[PDB]
Amino acid sequence: EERILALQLCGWIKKGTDVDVGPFLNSLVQEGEWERAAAVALFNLDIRRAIQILNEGASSELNLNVVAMALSGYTDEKNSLWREMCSTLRLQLN
């Protein structure tokens, strides 16, 4: 309970035992912020909702669709090409 005490104050969840962070997620999309709907979502371990946040927002505004491909795959290997490329390809974004 001490950890949910910190989560309620931050705003991840609402007053109540709702384990899903959906209320935050669905309030953010209607607020117009798309990235904050992606960072939080896959911080809850949802990588098919991860693309969904960027896919849903991609109809408005527009590079995130290409990032949706990059943000899809990852190999978790020891010398996979994704890991070497991504650590460098991060710092060039705003």
Added chain:
Amino acid sequence: EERILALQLCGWIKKGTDVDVGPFLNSLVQEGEWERAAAVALFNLDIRRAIQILNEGASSEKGDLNLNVVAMALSGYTDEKNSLWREMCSTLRLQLN
């Protein structure tokens, strides 16, 4: 021998048997078409060359934005039966310009 002439009439390799498309590439580099050079390099099975081409394309003439992240998203090739990037690339290929 017949198929080695077609490549001399499609303008990919100059006259001679030194079949390794490198003189064609740099022309496309310093000609104004980076993406075409990246594709032509890819058809010769070298993705790191495509990354190098696309980095130079993004850095110069500003205009990187999406042309930047497209390099990273092309960096993630996979050969599984259920590779998520593979499924997405198959689905949404037609949304690019």
